[PDB]
Amino acid sequence: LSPEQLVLTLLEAEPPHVLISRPSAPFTEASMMMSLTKLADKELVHMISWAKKIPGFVELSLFDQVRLLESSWMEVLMMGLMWRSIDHPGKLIFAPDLVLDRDEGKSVEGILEIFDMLLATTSRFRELKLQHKEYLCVKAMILLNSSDSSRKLAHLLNAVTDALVWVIAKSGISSQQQSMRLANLLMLLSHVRHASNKGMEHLLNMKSKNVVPVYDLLLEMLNA
């Protein structure tokens, strides 16, 4: 309800980290693909629970809730990945025991490009010194901006935006610097989204090539 209360609600709503183990053997195309898709499937379950904890979300049309999650899920996953990774330069921290290097991307054709984009965008957030409460708001904004229910959605997106504005203002920088910081953060939403688009394309191609396991929720979300 207040911006502080919305931020504290988002903080509480944060998903637990999903635990996946590194394969015993050096990565193959199959084992890398299995690890990342199993993780994605488990994180999607937790994402749905998270979205339902965003104040207001459950009051949207079910069809709106579906469309937003279907639209945004890989962006939300990637924003989470970038945040997990921001304290570990050079690494993509997919999970505590799934810590991947630009070079381990070599195991799957075309995935090194995705890893490079994610590492680069993470580095932009690191240089901006992205803060935890900023991340919370931005991740919610990714979901809510991905698309009477239409009015309610505008209202919910404005509330989260207002929260980010409040978070930035608590930093005590000048009005002009607060505006520049908001703009610099939001201009990265298209870089995360680019990485999402390239990741989704890649995963669809992998599903074609018969390397994606039967994970029910993931396949549903991939297919749209």
């Binding site: 749905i48 079910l62 809730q65 579906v66 999650l69 029910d216 929720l217 549903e220």
Partner: peptide, 10 residues
Amino acid sequence: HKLVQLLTTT
């Protein structure tokens, strides 16, 4: 189907 289940009956 699974998405709608998780949204509404969990």
